[PDB]
Structures are given as structure tokens and as C-alpha cells.
Design a protein around this ligand. Sequence first.
Ligand SMILES: O=C(NCCS(=O)(=O)c1ccccc1)c1nc([C@@H]2CCCN2C(=O)c2c(Cl)cncc2Cl)[nH]c(=O)c1O
Ligand SMILES: [Mn+2]
Ligand SMILES: [Mn+2]
Length: 179
Amino acid sequence: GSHMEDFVRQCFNPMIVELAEKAMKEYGEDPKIETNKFAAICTHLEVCFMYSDGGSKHRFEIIEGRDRIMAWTVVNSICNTTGVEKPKFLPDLYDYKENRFIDIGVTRREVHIYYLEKANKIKSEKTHIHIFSFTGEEMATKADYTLDEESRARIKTRLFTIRQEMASRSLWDSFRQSE
Ligand SMILES: O=C(NCCS(=O)(=O)c1ccccc1)c1nc([C@@H]2CCCN2C(=O)c2c(Cl)cncc2Cl)[nH]c(=O)c1O
Ligand SMILES: [Mn+2]
Ligand SMILES: [Mn+2]
């Protein structure tokens, strides 16, 4: 019973805690032991949700959060109706306005290093990449940040609040080094 686990459950809403637990069990991980990974997946899920709430009413199709079979099912329907290339790895959203997939990243390091790592792993030249850091930095493909400044600023504010809450509980140092 770690202090980080009880922080995660009181920091994020139950629906995000619920979806993070299922995703962790789907890949053979337990939130009780790998607690830094538990906090990271919750954080990434909330950012994806806030991101999709950034645009118009039905601009974004949410891929993250679904189980693997249904996520690929929605990816196939999106590809087989818009003509966009089928990515090698599952993205997080699909932008119906810009007609592209998005993989959102949240990192505790330099946005530069995580982008180059995500681009190499995703191996999908068409998938748009948007990186957020816990320090307020962001990096996106072709400098195209999709949403307006205020929607992104709310995400950055929430990320820094998560950092402060962890630091006030002496959980940030273990969280920052765990990446
Ligand atoms: O969607 C993802 N994974 C499933 C589809 S994948 O095809 O396996 C896939 C694998 C890698 C990258 C993208 C998709 C995904 N994963 C990651 C990282 C790296 C791999 C493990 N990992 C996590 O456990 C994780 C984290 Cl750290 C934060 N938030 C969610 C998750 Cl799962 N980073 C994401 O940005 C992300 O989108
Ligand atoms: Mn994802
Ligand atoms: Mn992602």
C-alpha cells in the first residue's frame, strides 16, 4: 500500500482511475506495484480527455481508453472512410477537422527527447504528435498545435498542479526519475 496509489485515486476522477486500471491489467501490470506508471497513465488519459474537449462539439474521435480490439476497430473505420493511412501503433485521437491521427505524449523530461523517441517508436509518418511536459512546454509536429492557445494552456496548468501535489507529498522526485 503505497502513498502514491492513494494519491492517484484522490487526484483523478474515478472514471480515469477505472480506465487506467483496465489498461494496466490489459498489459500485465498491477497499479499497486507499478505506481509511478499508474500515475503516468492516469495523467496521460486526463490530458487526452481535456484535449478532445478543446475543439468543436464532435471534432475528435477518442481512441485512447478503449480496449485494444475496439480501438483498432474504430481506427479501421476511420481509415476505411477518410483514406488516411492505417498507423502501425494505436494513436490517442483522430482529428476530423484536420483529418489526421494524434498521439499525445506527457513527459517529465525535455519535450525534445520524448518527441524523437515517440516518432521512432510510432513508425507512422502520418500520425501527428503533440507532446506536453510537466513544466509548461509543448512540442507538436510541423509546429501545428491543433487547438487554440487557451485549450492548451489549461492542459499545462493541470499538469503543473499535478506536479505540485506530488511535490507537497514528497512523491515528485521518485516520479520524475521513474521515467
Ligand atoms: O497508447 C499507448 N499505449 C497503448 C497502444 S500501443 O500501440 O501499445 C503504443 C505504444 C507506444 C506508444 C504509443 C502507443 C501509449 N503508451 C505510451 C507508453 C509507451 C508504451 C507504454 N506506455 C504506457 O504504458 C502509457 C503511458 Cl507511459 C501513458 N499513457 C498511456 C500508456 Cl498505455 N505512451 C503513449 O503516449 C501512448 O499513447
Ligand atoms: Mn495511446
Ligand atoms: Mn499517447
